[PDB]
Amino acid sequence: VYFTCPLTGATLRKDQRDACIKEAILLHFSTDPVAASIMKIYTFNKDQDRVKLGVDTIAKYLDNIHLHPEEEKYRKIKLQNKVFQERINCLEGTHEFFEAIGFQKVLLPAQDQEDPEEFYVLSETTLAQPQSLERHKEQLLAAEPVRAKLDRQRRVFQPSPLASQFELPGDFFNLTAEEIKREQRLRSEAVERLSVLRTKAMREKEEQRGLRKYNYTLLRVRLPDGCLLQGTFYARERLGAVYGFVREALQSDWLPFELLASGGQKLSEDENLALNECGLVPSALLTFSWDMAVLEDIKAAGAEPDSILKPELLSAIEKLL
Amino acid sequence: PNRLIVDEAINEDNSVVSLSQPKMDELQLFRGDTVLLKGKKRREAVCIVLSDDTCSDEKIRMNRVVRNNLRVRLGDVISIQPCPDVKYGKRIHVLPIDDTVEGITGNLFEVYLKPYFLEAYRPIRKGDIFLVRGGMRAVEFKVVETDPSPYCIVAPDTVIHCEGEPIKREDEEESLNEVGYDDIGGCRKQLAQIKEMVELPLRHPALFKAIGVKPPRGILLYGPPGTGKTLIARAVANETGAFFFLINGPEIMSKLAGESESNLRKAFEEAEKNAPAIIFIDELDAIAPKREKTHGEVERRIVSQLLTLMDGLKQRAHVIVMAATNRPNSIDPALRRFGRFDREVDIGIPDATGRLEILQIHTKNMKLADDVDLEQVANETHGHVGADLAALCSEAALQAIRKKMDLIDLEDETIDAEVMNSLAVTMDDFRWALSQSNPSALRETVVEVPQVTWEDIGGLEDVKRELQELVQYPVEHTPSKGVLFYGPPGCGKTLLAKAIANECQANFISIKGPELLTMWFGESEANVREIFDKARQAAPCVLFFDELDSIAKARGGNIGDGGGAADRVINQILTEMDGMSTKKNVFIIGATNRPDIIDPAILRPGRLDQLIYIPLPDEKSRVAILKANLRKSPVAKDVDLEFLAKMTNGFSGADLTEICQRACKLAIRESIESEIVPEIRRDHFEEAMRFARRSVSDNDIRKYEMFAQTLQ
Amino acid sequence: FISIKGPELLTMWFGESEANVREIFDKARQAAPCVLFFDELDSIAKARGGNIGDGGGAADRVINQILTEMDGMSTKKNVFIIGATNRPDIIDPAILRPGRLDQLIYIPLPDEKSRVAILKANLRKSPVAKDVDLEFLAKMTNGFSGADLTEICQRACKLAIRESIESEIVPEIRRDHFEEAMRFARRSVSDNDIRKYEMFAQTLQ
Ligand SMILES: Nc1ncnc2c1ncn2[C@@H]1O[C@H](COP(=O)(O)OP(=O)(O)O)[C@@H](O)[C@H]1O
């Protein structure tokens, strides 16, 4: 499965996504330190519940000094505060954000301890104009993690009749000693499994072995003109993204059509179901047909519907062998 | 490479096969892609491939229609070759097979071919034979012309033509209406046992020809009439290809001396000539009754001739003899000696699940109305066997036929297909047929998986765990093979045995006092051997001996007659228990309410080594019991079950049930009286408590506690 | 050695097939030299009620046929008869008369020195680590029978084997295997059963 890195445009595999995006965010600090630290807070940290609490606690510190900009006790954010330590100090990228939006990291004597404590102290340049922090606060709170976009890898194929021409050896149908002994052992084991007296826990331990193999799917569409349209989808993707994918591939993206699933169930564009709920994962072929309303006009006008896809995709058609 | 062993289908559809996903990934084909299957005699078939969670990695699942087109059988190997180049067809010419279009006329396309292919996009190859069901007939068609070649996918724009006379079936083509494995409903385990014993020597005869060790010479199928004894024998022969020879008692016994024995041995000679072959002898007890029952020369001589013919099977290679009887003890015991008919299978009576499957089989060709609920029918048809469910479906169809045909008024040799197409069997027609049908196996014991679950038992949290450990430990890792339950009545002894059987999906055999007493009273304790033999055949099962002291009590209990704690039946039970191993997948549970008068032999090492006390429920358990009993009814929020449980300190689980049932009855009465309220109110429980009493006294609890401490 | 079990004596009575008693003694005559062992001699008295029963004695069809065959068996055929029961108080006294099973031997639960001997004997087939304290185990298993002491040693053997097999995915049974075995082993004979046997033995003087 292939993805596009949102910050670079690079082509990556499923395992290479975090490595490239993280590097792009760390380099982005040379253009916009605030935007880079915002991406770093949401992207690097896997625990999004803590990230949401972290950025909300940062927003409160910024509004506190906004309400009382003349009081020095709101100008310094203590890094050892119970709420700061749990929500902000535990996340990667939160320190870079404070520096990016005008806070200096300093050590100040404590009111009751000899050891100096860590503070983020807002400079006079930014404190004089609260509008800067107010914009940076909204830029952090409205942000999302950076994740590589799934590459559809839109391709059209033309099957070659040569792939179906093959003859078997004369001994093909003569089974070996291992194949015959294995089959008889499976018959004896199947009778034994039906005879075994076991609890539900033992039954589930065996059944559960088939539950974890797939999270992506490859879909193909068989078109009336003999062409095959293929693309890549996430297991949780909705049926509406498949209709949008096909519409982009069609010569006429506006012309009504239906997609029929391999089990005989018609998939409607208005049905917001996931591909792993409709039985289209890890792979499936869909059957393409135009709506009957337009087919009646096409036939009545004497027009042969000899082209389904746009020439922009067909010029790159590959053969299947 | 790219070749799998042919197995049975799960999806009955004729255009699809199922693979295990890892093989579809190696073949680089997707769910719904069209593939070719390469079979024997340079034949091929085109179909759609899907996947499921049950197909073996090295097998392909396909139904009878696909196997016949490939001229292959279960256990063979075929090659899978994806063919994405298949295009949509323009014109396909399909004609019926004459063998299945007889007595029926009209427009077969509109009734059968059109809805079958319409928007189905089924792959079709020239020469294919496929089955379309409807109109209470099974009509199959052969494809004679395709504009594209040699195969295509039918589309809504494809012309479907059907002009010409029906096609006469070729001698190499088998009828799809012949009984096979897909026509057998319940008794799946028994069919699997026959496969293990029979399919190998028939599909791979060379494995037994090169060695001096013969395959099983005879299999005795026994059980009530109408359970599928003959159906299994025919299905196995038809699926493997072995020649099937039908013999029955009356056919041989009706013949005169000399002719009778000649016909019996002639059939055996024919089986050798047509080997591999299966010889099915029905009513074995009629052809070979016990000799001591008659002085006739013909009856003795026929038994002797059958005995020698069975022994001659060491020469008649690849011939297997199967026989059917009502009971294994109703036949001449000589047949069951080493060899001959030393292997037997108990077919039994289908349970609720099997009965539903049987009904679905008989309705294969039947058009049902939307209100028909075959699962509800299967639940009501207790005591019925497949022969009775076949009659049930036929009678329901005949009632529907009369209702509509009396409006059609067509008097001719054939009936139009459109008339049959519009005919449907509704719930009123099955309900009528149920009232007229009478089960043939109502007196025989029905053994099935119980429906009692752990949520139906209040309290006893530790006993639930103990039973799960006793069954789970010998499977996950000498373990005991039985437990005795003792304590006051009405605390869940029976439910515990059923609930563990339920969770294990094990058969539950319920033996009650009256059954133990009947065997004692009639001096028929020999039936205990059949009970334990049933427990083995029913494995996995829980064999529950309730009221173990019912005979000791009937003989006096506290006073006594000529006996004491032991009797005819208990001693035979002790005998059989010594012959049952922990590996037989049978868990024996006993119960008694009077442990002081029970034969102590049952608790000796090797038998009921586990001993569990079931006390009266405590306060939190009584609440759980009340909630379980009311789990199936609407209850108002004003009902305080915890307060009730606090009061009913001396009540057993059975006594708390009476309170719940009285409150339910009162709610029903009030609702009916108002119609002439929708939920059970506190007023109904307050009235119920006025009549309910504790059934277990304080002195009885002391009796049980003393026993518990005596044995520890 | 010919093993005759209670279920055979019980079936013969209920099925009115005492002729099978002759088959048992005839087999012993033909198998000679042999020891004909009649287990569960109490099964006949129990069949008549055992703990309750009627008001009569223990005499019945099966015991009468057995006693008849015993009287007709000569010691010159090299056939010796041994009986056993777990309920000696209800054995038909006729079988204890001169010419029958007149000799009575009491077999109690093993004592302190016997239990150690049993634990040691069961381990002759496997190496035993020096840290295994068999006398300590015998002291704890005061209420255990020889059958229960065997389970302890055999379970410890299985546990040592389990570890040995796993080590290749050990050369001897270690103290940990015996201490673990003690977690599952239980006594099969209760204190009330012991007193019943001791009181009977005392009654015989
Ligand atoms: N277990 C079963 N599954 C499906 N159908 C069954 C079963 N048992 C009986 N039948 C049906 O009942 C009839 C049995 O009649 P028959 O061929 O005489 O067999 P038998 O009398 O030996 O059961 C058939 O119509 C068969 O389809």
Ligand SMILES: Nc1ncnc2c1ncn2[C@@H]1O[C@H](COP(=O)(O)OP(=O)(O)O)[C@@H](O)[C@H]1O
């Ligand atoms: N522990 C329990 N939990 C729930 N219901 C119980 C319990 N014990 C008894 N009952 C009620 O008593 C009825 C009879 O139980 P059953 O197990 O048949 O008693 P027994 O085993 O003494 O014949 C059941 O219908 C059930 O509703």
